Amino acid sequence: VLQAKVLDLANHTTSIHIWPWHEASTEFAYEDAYSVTIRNKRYTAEVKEF
């Protein structure tokens, strides 16, 4: 499956400096939610990531 080893962190990271990273990183924001209306009554929630 030609496996797939994909590079990773510097672990021994201790000084060192990336190079293109920012792109290479994403914030985890996130929007959206999670709700249901049952009965007629809406029950409601979000996402609230942390």
Binding site: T37, I38, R39, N40
Partner: protein, 51 residues
């Protein structure tokens, strides 16, 4: 021919099959309500889940 040999005619009469008619219809009858009644309830569904 479903019955095997020939051949259909006025004669050959058969004694009745009563019991079962009484029964059958029962089975039968039931469903009927149920869909029906259900359907409506299915309609009316004030909430989702139930439906």
């Amino acid at each position: 021919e479903l019955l095997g040999l020939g051949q259909r005619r006025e004669r050959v009469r058969i004694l009745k099959p009563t019991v079962a008619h009484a029964i059958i219809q029962m089975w039968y009858s039931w469903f009927v309500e149920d869909d029906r009644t259900l359907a409506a309830a299915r309609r009316t569904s004030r909430d989702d889940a139930e439906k």
